[PDB]
């Protein structure tokens, strides 16, 4: 079998499933682990954007009450170390001790915030586990299909510990772990004891090539089979090669810039909203994205389904109001730092370059500050770029896990969110779908735009480039799927 060589924008600091949640982690962890329920992006001939939930580690599942889902596990499934997967492994993945409990903050810092109001799971037998919540939650199934729900082995994980497990992971996935050289590569080999769609590559190498130019030149050479995180400006050149092509898709993610509200200059919404109101997103989509990116109407995405508002007005663009807000704010004229990790996010640097000029024309002076892969101290950062993968078929993620009263934007970044925002966050968690929940999400979307804790830029069009003899198609998520989606020749 052929060894797959990948040229990537970055690598996660840990291969622990939850700690790996990023634009760079899922493409690796999806090969090491499996979930109970899997999303089949290619269901009913869809171009890698289907929302259909299929059985994976769980052969079948059933909803008992408004707060619990039972899982009937697939039998004789093995972890890479040779240990058999049981209800105890699933119970440990969703346990207080490891994920959502107070003691889990040392293992997985974002576990509690990204999790549902979980209760300790119920093991019924070797292949039967009930996942439950303390309060009603109709979000169990979507969470179970997410990047939060990759099954870890209890015994091996407990022996090693979260930090050590992240450097030497063991899962049930189609690709076992081989080696991890920080700031260099991640090597995975074919797991031929795999239960499902069998591995087609003998090995997979995730090689970091931080500079997109070096990455393209690498594919042309040809050092790599598939390269990630390109810009639609790379389409013309790559496609002009007979053996090469680009493969792109709009991903269920949004690029953004956020503030450190612990800093005196960003304590008031005045300057934050002024920066948001000066952002001309349509020219950014023309200049940098060549029409390929999508501008959402606020914290609203179609993957929310019943909680998506298609009648929602576009985010306000008002240069004159922005000027007024800068003047009303306490902003003196002191340069404000904007932190970026080169081009970890596609078009990160050209986007900031454009925005610095937009902000200059409103009275704000913004300065670029770059940081090497792996982040500066919180107190040393003012403005910074970020992204949020909308990991649920509901509006809960990411407005609640990231911007909620138990989330990192308020607790770590110091956003003094209005009481009304936090109250609605509690309702949407517990309530079923209806007018109350729909309007609750809409008022939160209105509060988010008024407060400006973060400024949504656009939905990036993910651009990959591969060798034509490598048959792989992208999915509408910040991950790569190779299950029934990888062949050579
Ligand atoms: O990749 P991100 O956009 O990940 C998002 C998540 O933060 C979450 O909001 C849900 O959607 C995802 O898209 O952002 C990175 C974030 C993730 O940990 O932290 C940053 C900050 O610099 O990157 C660090 O973590 C990475 C993972 O270990 C990364 O490999 C590393 O280079 C770090 O800098 C951010 O880019």
CA-nearest residue for atom 17, ligand 1, is: 22
Q: Are residues 131 and 215 in the same domain?
A: no
Question: Is the beta carbon of 388 within 6 A of some atom in ligand 1?
Answer: yes
Question: What are the Cα distances from residue 282, in Å, to 289, 425, 450, 454?
Answer: 10, 30, 20, 18
Q: Cα–Cα distance between 370 and 428 in angstroms, integer? A: 38
484 C-alpha vs ligand 1 centroid, how far in Å?
A: 28
21 C-alpha vs ligand 1 centroid, how far in Å?
A: 7
**Which residues lie across from 369 on neighbouring strands?**
339
Q: Are residues 345 and 260 in the same domain?
A: yes
Q: Are residues 39 and 127 in the same domain?
A: yes
391 C-alpha vs ligand 1 centroid, how far in Å?
A: 14
Segment holding 366, helix H or strand E:
strand 366-370
Atom of ligand 1 nearest to the CA of 25: 27
Say which residue the tokens 């992006």 belong to: 41
Domain boundary among 152, 187, 222: 152
Q: Are residues 85 and 52 in the same domain?
A: yes
- Which three-class secondary structure state does DSSP give residue 346? coil
| CATH number assigned to the domain comprising residue 5 | 3.40.190.10
DSSP string, 431-458: --SSHHHHHHHHHHHHHHHHH-SEEEEE
For 142, how many CA atoms within 13 A lie in the half-sphere containing its CB? 18
Q: What would the two tokens of residue 333 be?
A: 């004229």
Q: Are residues 239 and 322 in the same domain?
A: no
CA-nearest residue for atom 27, ligand 1, is: 12
**Number of domains composing the chain:** 3
| DSSP structural state of residue 315 | P
| DSSP structural state of residue 335 | P
Domain boundary among 152, 183, 199: 152
73 C-alpha vs ligand 1 centroid, how far in Å?
A: 32
Segment holding 255, helix H or strand E:
strand 253-259
Q: Are residues 317 and 451 in the same domain?
A: yes
Q: Which of 402, 364, 155 is nearest to 275 (CA)?
A: 364
| CATH number assigned to the domain comprising residue 78 | 3.90.76.10
Pairing label, strands 68-73, 336-340: unpaired
In angstroms, this model's resolution equals 2.7
328 C-alpha vs ligand 1 centroid, how far in Å?
A: 34
- Which three-class secondary structure state does DSSP give residue 8? strand
Neighbours of 82 (CB within 10 A): 8
Q: Per 3-state DSSP, what percentage of the chain is helix, strand, and coil (rounded to 5)? A: 30, 20, 45
CA-nearest residue for atom 8, ligand 1, is: 388
Question: Is the beta carbon of 381 within 6 A of some atom in ligand 1?
Answer: no
For 236, how many CA atoms within 13 A lie in the half-sphere containing its CB? 3
- Which three-class secondary structure state does DSSP give residue 245? strand
**Which residues lie across from 270 on neighbouring strands?**
none
Contact at 8 Å (CB) between 281 and 315?
A: yes
Q: Which of 12, 13, 20, 22 to mutate to test the pocket of ligand 1 (most atoms within 8 A of CB)?
A: 22
Q: Cα–Cα distance between 371 and 388 in angstroms, integer? A: 20
Contact at 8 Å (CB) between 184 and 373?
A: no
345 C-alpha vs ligand 1 centroid, how far in Å?
A: 10
- Phi and psi angles of residue 471, each rounded to the nearest 5 degrees, phi first: -95, 100
Contact at 8 Å (CB) between 113 and 154?
A: no
Elucidation technique: X-ray
CA-nearest residue for atom 22, ligand 1, is: 375
Contact at 8 Å (CB) between 200 and 1?
A: yes
Q: Are residues 392 and 427 in the same domain?
A: yes
Q: Are residues 335 and 456 in the same domain?
A: yes
Q: What would the two tokens of residue 111 be?
A: 């576990």
Q: 242, exposed or middle or buried, with CB in 10 Å at 0-12, 13-18, 19+? A: exposed
Q: Which domain, by its residues, includes 352?
A: 252-460
Residues 6+ apart with CB under 8 A from 146: 35, 391, 392, 397
- Report the Cα–Cα distance between both ends of the chain, in Å, rounded: 11
Segment holding 283, helix H or strand E:
helix 281-287
Question: Is the beta carbon of 374 within 6 A of some atom in ligand 1?
Answer: yes
Q: Are residues 15 and 41 in the same domain?
A: no
Question: Is the beta carbon of 389 within 6 A of some atom in ligand 1?
Answer: yes
Question: Is the beta carbon of 413 within 6 A of some atom in ligand 1?
Answer: no
Atom of ligand 1 nearest to the CA of 341: 22
CA-nearest residue for atom 33, ligand 1, is: 374
Domain boundary among 100, 127, 152: 152
Contact at 8 Å (CB) between 72 and 36?
A: no
Q: Are residues 238 and 258 in the same domain?
A: no
Q: Are residues 448 and 473 in the same domain?
A: no
Neighbours of 80 (CB within 10 A): 20
Question: Is the beta carbon of 387 within 6 A of some atom in ligand 1?
Answer: yes
Q: Which of 233, 250, 255, 229 is nearest to 352 (CA)?
A: 255
Q: Which of 391, 473, 368, 446 is nearest to 20 (CA)?
A: 391
Q: What would the two tokens of residue 146 be?
A: 């997410």
| CATH number assigned to the domain comprising residue 429 | 3.10.105.10
For 313, how many CA atoms within 13 A lie in the half-sphere containing its CB? 6
Contact at 8 Å (CB) between 397 and 391?
A: yes
Residues 6+ apart with CB under 8 A from 486: 4, 200, 201, 470, 471, 472
Q: Which of 14, 386, 409, 410 to mutate to test the pocket of ligand 1 (most atoms within 8 A of CB)?
A: 386
374 C-alpha vs ligand 1 centroid, how far in Å?
A: 10
Question: What are the Cα distances from residue 191, in Å, to 81, 321, 324?
Answer: 11, 58, 61
Q: Which of 191, 209, 193, 211 is nearest to 201 (CA)?
A: 191
176 C-alpha vs ligand 1 centroid, how far in Å?
A: 23
Longest Cα–Cα distance of the chain, Å, equals: 67
Contact at 8 Å (CB) between 108 and 13?
A: no
Q: Cα–Cα distance between 457 and 286 in angstroms, integer? A: 13
Q: Are residues 140 and 94 in the same domain?
A: yes
Question: Is the beta carbon of 454 within 6 A of some atom in ligand 1?
Answer: no
- Do you know the residue count of the chain? 489
């Amino acid at each position: 079998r052929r060894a797959l060589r990948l040229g990537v924008n970055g690598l996660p600091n840990s291969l622990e499933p939850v700690n790996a949640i990023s634009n760079v982690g899922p493409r690796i962890v999806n090969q090491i682990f499996d979930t109970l329920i899997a999303r089949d992006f290619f269901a009913k001939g869809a171009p890698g954007n289907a929302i259909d939930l299929v059985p994976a580690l769980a052969e079948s599942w059933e909803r008992i009450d408004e707060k619990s889902v039972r899982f009937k596990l697939r039998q004789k499934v093995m972890f890479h170390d040779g240990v058999e997967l049981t209800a105890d492994d699933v119970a440990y993945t969703f346990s207080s001790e490891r994920l959502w409990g107070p003691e889990a903050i040392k293992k997985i810092p974002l576990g509690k915030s990204y999790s549902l109001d979980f209760d300790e799971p119920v093991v019924e037998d070797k292949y039967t586990v009930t996942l439950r919540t303390k309060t009603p939650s109709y979000l169990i199934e979507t969470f179970v299909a997410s990047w939060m729900s990759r099954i870890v082995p209890k015994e091996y994980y407990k022996k090693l510990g979260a930090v050590d497990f992240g450097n030497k992971p063991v899962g049930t996935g189609p690709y076992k772990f081989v080696e991890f050289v920080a700031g260099d590569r991640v090597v995975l080999e074919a797991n031929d004891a795999y239960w499902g769609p069998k591995p087609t590559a003998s090995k997979i190498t995730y090689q970091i090539v931080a500079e997109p130019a070096t990455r393209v030149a690498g594919l042309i050479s040809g050092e790599y089979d598939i390269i990630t995180t390109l810009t639609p400006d790379d389409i013309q050149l790559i496609n002009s090669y007979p053996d090469l092509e680009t493969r792109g898709t709009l991903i269920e993610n949004f690029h953004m810039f956020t503030f450190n509200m612990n800093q005196e200059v960003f304590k008031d919404k005045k300057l934050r909203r002024a920066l948001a109101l000066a952002v001309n997103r349509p020219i950014m989509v023309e200049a940098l994205w060549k029409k390929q990116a999508s501008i959402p109407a606020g914290f609203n995405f179609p993957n929310y389904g019943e909680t998506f508002d298609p009648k929602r007005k576009a985010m306000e663009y008002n240069v004159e109001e922005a000027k007024r807000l800068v003047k009303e704010s306490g902003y003196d004229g002191t340069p404000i730092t904007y932190h970026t990790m080169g081009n970890y996010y596609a078009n990160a640097m050209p986007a900031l370059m454009m925005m610095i000029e937009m902000w200059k024309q409103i009275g704000v002076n913004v300065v670029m500050k770059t940081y090497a892969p792996g982040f500066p101290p919180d107190n040393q950062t003012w403005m910074r770029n970020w992204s949020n993968g909308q990991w649920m078929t509901d509006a809960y993620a990411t407005i609640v896990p990231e911007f909620g009263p138990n989330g990192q934007v308020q607790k770590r970044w110091g956003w003094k969110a209005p009481a009304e925002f936090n109250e609605l966050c509690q309702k949407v968690t517990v309530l079923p779908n209806g007018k109350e929940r729909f309007d609750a999400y809409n008022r939160m979307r209105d509060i988010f735009e008024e407060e400006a804790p973060a400024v949504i830029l656009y939905q990036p069009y993910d651009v990959y480039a591969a060798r034509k003899d490598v048959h792989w198609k992208p999915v509408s998520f910040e991950m790569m799927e190779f299950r029934n989606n990888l062949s050579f020749g």
